[PDB]
Amino acid sequence: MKVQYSFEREFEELMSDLLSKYGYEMFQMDGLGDQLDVVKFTEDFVRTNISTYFIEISKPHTYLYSLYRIWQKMKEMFGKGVADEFVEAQINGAVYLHDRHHAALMPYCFAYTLKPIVEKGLPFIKTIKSEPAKHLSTFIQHVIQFVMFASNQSSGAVGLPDFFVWMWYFVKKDLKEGIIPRDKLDWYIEQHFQILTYSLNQPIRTTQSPYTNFTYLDRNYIKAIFEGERYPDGSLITDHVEDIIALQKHYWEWVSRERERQMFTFPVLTASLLYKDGKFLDEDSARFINKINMKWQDTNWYISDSIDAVASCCEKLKGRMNSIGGSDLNIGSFKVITVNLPRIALESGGDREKYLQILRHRVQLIKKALAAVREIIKERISEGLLPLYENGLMLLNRQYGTIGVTGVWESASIMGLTTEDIDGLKYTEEGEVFVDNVLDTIREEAEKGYHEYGFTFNIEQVPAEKAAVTLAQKDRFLFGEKQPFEIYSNQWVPLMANTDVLNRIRYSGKWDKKVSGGAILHINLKTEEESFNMVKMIADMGVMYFAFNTKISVCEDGHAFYGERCPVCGKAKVDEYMRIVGYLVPVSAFNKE
Amino acid sequence: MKVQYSFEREFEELMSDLLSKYGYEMFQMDGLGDQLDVVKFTEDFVTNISTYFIEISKPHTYLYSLYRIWQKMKEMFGKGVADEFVEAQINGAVYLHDRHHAALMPYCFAYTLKPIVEKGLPFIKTIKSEPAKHLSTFIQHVIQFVMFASNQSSGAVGLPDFFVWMWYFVKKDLKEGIIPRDKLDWYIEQHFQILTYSLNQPIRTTQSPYTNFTYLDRNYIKAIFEGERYPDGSLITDHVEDIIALQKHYWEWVSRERERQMFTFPVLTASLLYKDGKFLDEDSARFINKINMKWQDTNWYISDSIDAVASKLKGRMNSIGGSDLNIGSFKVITVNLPRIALESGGDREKYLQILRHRVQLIKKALAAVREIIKERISEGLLPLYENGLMLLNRQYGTIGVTGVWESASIMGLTTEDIDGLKYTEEGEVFVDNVLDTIREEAEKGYHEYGFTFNIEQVPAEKAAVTLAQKDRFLFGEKQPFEIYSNQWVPLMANTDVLNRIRYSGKWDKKVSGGAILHINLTEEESFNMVKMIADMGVMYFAFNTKISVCEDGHAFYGERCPVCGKAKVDEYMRIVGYLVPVSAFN
Ligand SMILES: Nc1ncnc2c1ncn2[C@H]1C[C@H](O)[C@@H](COP(=O)(O)OP(=O)(O)OP(=O)(O)O)O1
Ligand SMILES: Nc1ncnc2c1ncn2[C@H]1C[C@H](O)[C@@H](COP(=O)(O)OP(=O)(O)OP(=O)(O)O)O1
Ligand SMILES: [Mg+2]
Numbered sequence A: 001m002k003v004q005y006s007f008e009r010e011f012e013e014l015m016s017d018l019l020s021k022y023g024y025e026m027f028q029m030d031g032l033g034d035q036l037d038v039v040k041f042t043e044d045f046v047r048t049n050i051s052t053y054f055i056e057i058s059k060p061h062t063y064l065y066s067l068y069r070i071w072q073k074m075k076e077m078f079g080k081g082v083a084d085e086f087v088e089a090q091i092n093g094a095v096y097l098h099d100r101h102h103a104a105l106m107p108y109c110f111a112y113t114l115k116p117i118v119e120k121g122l123p124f125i126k127t128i129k130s131e132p133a134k135h136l137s138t139f140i141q142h143v144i145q146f147v148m149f150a151s152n153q154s155s156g157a158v159g160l161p162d163f164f165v166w167m168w169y170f171v172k173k174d175l176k177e178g179i180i181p182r183d184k185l186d187w188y189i190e191q192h193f194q195i196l197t198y199s200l201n202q203p204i205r206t207t208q209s210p211y212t213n214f215t216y217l218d219r220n221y222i223k224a225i226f227e228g229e230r231y232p233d234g235s236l237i238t239d240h241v242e243d244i245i246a247l248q249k250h251y252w253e254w255v256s257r258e259r260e261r262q263m264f265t266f267p268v269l270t271a272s273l274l275y276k277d278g279k280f281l282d283e284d285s286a287r288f289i290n291k292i293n294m295k296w297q298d299t300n301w302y303i304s305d306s307i308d309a310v311a312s313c314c315e316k317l318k319g320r321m322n323s324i325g326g327s328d329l330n331i332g333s334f335k336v337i338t339v340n341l342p343r344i345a346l347e348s349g350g351d352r353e354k355y356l357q358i359l360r361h362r363v364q365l366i367k368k369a370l371a372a373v374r375e376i377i378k379e380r381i382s383e384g385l386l387p388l389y390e391n392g393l394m395l396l397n398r399q400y401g402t403i404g405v406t407g408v409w410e411s412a413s414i415m416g417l418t419t420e421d422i423d424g425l426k427y428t429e430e431g432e433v434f435v436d437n438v439l440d441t442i443r444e445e446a447e448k449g450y451h452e453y454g455f456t457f458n459i460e461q462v463p464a465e466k467a468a469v470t471l472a473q474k475d476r477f478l479f480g481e482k483q484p485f486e487i488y489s490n491q492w493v494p495l496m497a498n499t500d501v502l503n504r505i506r507y508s509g510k511w512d513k514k515v516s517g518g519a520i521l522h523i524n525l526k527t528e529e530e531s532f533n534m535v536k537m538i539a540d541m542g543v544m545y546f547a548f549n550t551k552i553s554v555c556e557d558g559h560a561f562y563g564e565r566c567p568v569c570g571k572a573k574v575d576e577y578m579r580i581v582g583y584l585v586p587v588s589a590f591n592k593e
Numbered sequence B: 001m002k003v004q005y006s007f008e009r010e011f012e013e014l015m016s017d018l019l020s021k022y023g024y025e026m027f028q029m030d031g032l033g034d035q036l037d038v039v040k041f042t043e044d045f046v047t048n049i050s051t052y053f054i055e056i057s058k059p060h061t062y063l064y065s066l067y068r069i070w071q072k073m074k075e076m077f078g079k080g081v082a083d084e085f086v087e088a089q090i091n092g093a094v095y096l097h098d099r100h101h102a103a104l105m106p107y108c109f110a111y112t113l114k115p116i117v118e119k120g121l122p123f124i125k126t127i128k129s130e131p132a133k134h135l136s137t138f139i140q141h142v143i144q145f146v147m148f149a150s151n152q153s154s155g156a157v158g159l160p161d162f163f164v165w166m167w168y169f170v171k172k173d174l175k176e177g178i179i180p181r182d183k184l185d186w187y188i189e190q191h192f193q194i195l196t197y198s199l200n201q202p203i204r205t206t207q208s209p210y211t212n213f214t215y216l217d218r219n220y221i222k223a224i225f226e227g228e229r230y231p232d233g234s235l236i237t238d239h240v241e242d243i244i245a246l247q248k249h250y251w252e253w254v255s256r257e258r259e260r261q262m263f264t265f266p267v268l269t270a271s272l273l274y275k276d277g278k279f280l281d282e283d284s285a286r287f288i289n290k291i292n293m294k295w296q297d298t299n300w301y302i303s304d305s306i307d308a309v310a311s312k313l314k315g316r317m318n319s320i321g322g323s324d325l326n327i328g329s330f331k332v333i334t335v336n337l338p339r340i341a342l343e344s345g346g347d348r349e350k351y352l353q354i355l356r357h358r359v360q361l362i363k364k365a366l367a368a369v370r371e372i373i374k375e376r377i378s379e380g381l382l383p384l385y386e387n388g389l390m391l392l393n394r395q396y397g398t399i400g401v402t403g404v405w406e407s408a409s410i411m412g413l414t415t416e417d418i419d420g421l422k423y424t425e426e427g428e429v430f431v432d433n434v435l436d437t438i439r440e441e442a443e444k445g446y447h448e449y450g451f452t453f454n455i456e457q458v459p460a461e462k463a464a465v466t467l468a469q470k471d472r473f474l475f476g477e478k479q480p481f482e483i484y485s486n487q488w489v490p491l492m493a494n495t496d497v498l499n500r501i502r503y504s505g506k507w508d509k510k511v512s513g514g515a516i517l518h519i520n521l522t523e524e525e526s527f528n529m530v531k532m533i534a535d536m537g538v539m540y541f542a543f544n545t546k547i548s549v550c551e552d553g554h555a556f557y558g559e560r561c562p563v564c565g566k567a568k569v570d571e572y573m574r575i576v577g578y579l580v581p582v583s584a585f586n
């Protein structure tokens, strides 16, 4: 059977032209080949559970639609040549549209404040309306319902950086009123940590858990963010800093225990710490995080030298945006489109000037596509399809359009600008200059973007879980032996490249600021003080987001431990949890993916 | 742009032939026209965005399911039969329910929570949950299980023994000092509330999952849980009065809660043993009668025996509510009775010949679907079966019927005296014969295919319109009805209630309670009414009110909200058996 998809003939002609230029294999690589054949797809799938099938089946189709709609909007906004160039660039892998199956339908991510949930309840869920919570149990429930709702209204992370700020209030409320028996206080609190955590590790996105983030806000961040802000009882939140800190500590301690009973990925843990001139301004919290991380190293370190960006937070945008975690409160991205840097290397043939010309052009194109996607999102808002915006939870003016990068290293290598020395692999001095130039060029274009388009652009060295493979594959298809890499890197130095850790640290210290913390350094693994000094040294060097990695063992029943033998049930290790792209996941899963 | 779906040529040729015969607009009516065009569908669609991703693929997974069923029927019965089923499905002679899921997952089941209480959540792989030790987590587990189950099946997730198991965790939490003494009621009710509000969240996304609660009378608790024990070793039957009190507690709570916020789920049934003109649990019956006075939000299930639930498949299966513990259906396929009326030309013999044949076809399609489900189980796609929550041997294949009235009307077997619209005597005989034929075939089915068939007069929320439309398309002015009926006589028919009751009293037993009677509307009068209706042999029934709501969702009666003062904007009403917003229904 043949099914008609009703495209404007110009798009049809484009698609035929591109299929004629590149061949069916390219489209197949892009996921617009046999994947559109529902019979083949289903037959393929039936040889996880059935609920997945209904998620996966339509992705090629909604990607195709999204691409078509983006092409329409871009043609409208910039003319046929630009739209055509973007489609060709997306299909052939010069760029990478993230969440492409969602791209014309809904936005990427946001790190929310729970203030509107606490204050208004759940009016935006309309099968049934909930009043503002009056108890801990229901605050927790509301957070769950909100996460489930938001996770199906966006493609990326649902951040909850101020969770404990608000949780504390209901803990105190229920303690005071005798809803929580005093002698059951600790059990209660931990029972609600547990209920939340487990719920956040259920398959609500069907195929997988939603992606959620928690942040341990240090005293500086709480004070800065919540200056002047009041709880429902009318009291100042800033008057309860120690209570909030203590509750955050309780969760982190609980987590660390609870892993023994059951390992879990979510929420991803970040600790946000103010650090300047060689010292933490909330040293007690830094030392706490340092101590608690000793066991599983399950928390990512976020370092900032200023709270100016988050000052009194609760048009040009300044707060940190990171796909892994550590996104500042009320910051997100509506879409990421990544520039394929190795492609430019391959196209450049070693000419750095050529490279930079092409790069600038591509980033201008990507900006145009982001602007288009933003217009489409505005259309969706207007059509009533995205109630997170209408209810003031997701804020469009607090969302960047993201210019993604991947394959910096491989790009440098193809250009002949990498080498080895006694310290291991590294950039040549000219290579380091080259990366400086690349990042600086992208920065300049991002900066001009705000005046060009009226919203703010950011840069991120993206996790690229899929893009890292797909782009390498496409480049390999187009350039063959010239592209020797099977996967592109999502860190300045490839994770699996024996190098001096000091050089990794150095490069992150040089380049994190250029992407405004849109990166991660994670170092695979003494005394507690040595750990603290290591942390300080890393922070001193200007690294903005980092973590250390252990290899966490798990048995078939999900108990977390180290070694080949479970201390709870005595069963054998059957899998590992590791931080591969910045959060803790099963290695079997990742390998399979 | 052309996109290729790779079918066997025989099926492509079949579909080409059917398209040649019936024309594009039939395919359109079947949901295999424009709806397959993702661009048109998408641009027409642009509820929230989450809906879009649910709806977009339905035509496609339907097309695939129709194809796979065709393949399996060809395998099992040969090409002619498979072809005939596809033709019948496309042209509306039969109606395949949940057709977008039909080759992928099963329909419904009424679960016991015993394995959840005893094993926790093993079927969930992202994180493993131990058995609940507390009420809070028992509630959470029920929530997670409902969410899981509702995405592994197309229809109701029944929880008839919910309160049996909730009571244990109430008692347990109480013993352990977890509950604030002086706030026991608040606590129990807070958990009622948490569960109930969770069960009315969009997590089938477009709409809430469909769940059922049953108030089990003392006879049912005793019969079902003879010999069974709680985790602490105590006999469940030692706690009948405790269980009843908790059920009573829930029913009262809901009745209050509706004023603060109206909700559909869970659909409430009360299951009562009634024999020789009296309830064997009269306390419960009077309780239900009393609580129903406010909202009439509970459906009455009447049985003359508990043999089927004690300790070939026998228990009651009903798509609205009241399905017995550990009973379900893996799929319903409905016969279009008006089609048969129209094909027969008024000849009752021919009508019955066609009916019998078409029901045999339906049995074959059901057998095929069951084989497919079994394949899906073997492929590890349906863990509800692997974990012994859904039990395939406790699932009927369901022969649906709809448009009984309209069918009899087209045959010239209905009339109108002074007591309003009714069947003629020969019409009553006609319905007798139709249902007897379907029954005969359903019974032969067991020995034919190795599993049990039931019959239901289905709610037909969609089918009632779609089938009427297709028949209008094929037969024109010979089919004068805008919609087909899902009760023995149409809800909005000028008809004496005594007739409705009599018909239900005649024909409910023939479909083994796979039907519902509901009538649009002092305590004693109410109770006498209930008793009289039960005397007549009606097996499942309800009375309806018009329940107003304001924008804030408060339930009330009248044009203005007594709580907030805002105007009425919508109505909750029982249209097909459960209470739903009228606005949405249209
Ligand atoms: N929201 C949830 N969804 C699914 N499983 C959950 C949820 N919350 C907790 N669980 C899991 C954790 C345990 O594996 C299991 C039982 O939890 P619970 O009854 O609280 O006992 P427990 O082992 O936590 O003992 P205690 O609470 O007395 O410390 O359910
Ligand atoms: N699981 C849930 N999901 C969404 N909303 C819920 C859930 N459970 C309860 N709610 C709603 C009911 C109320 O509208 C709102 C607040 O409930 P709650 O904090 O218990 O206050 P309440 O009004 O029930 O007072 P009280 O519990 O003191 O009688 O949340
Ligand atoms: Mg617990």
Ligand SMILES: [Mg+2]
Pocket: B189, B190, B193
């Ligand atoms: Mg409450």
Ligand SMILES: [Zn+2]
Pocket: A555, A556, A557, A558, A559, A566, A567, A568, A569, A570, A571
């Ligand atoms: Zn173990």
Ligand SMILES: [Zn+2]
Pocket: B550, B551, B552, B553, B554, B561, B562, B563, B564, B565, B566
């Ligand atoms: Zn009101």
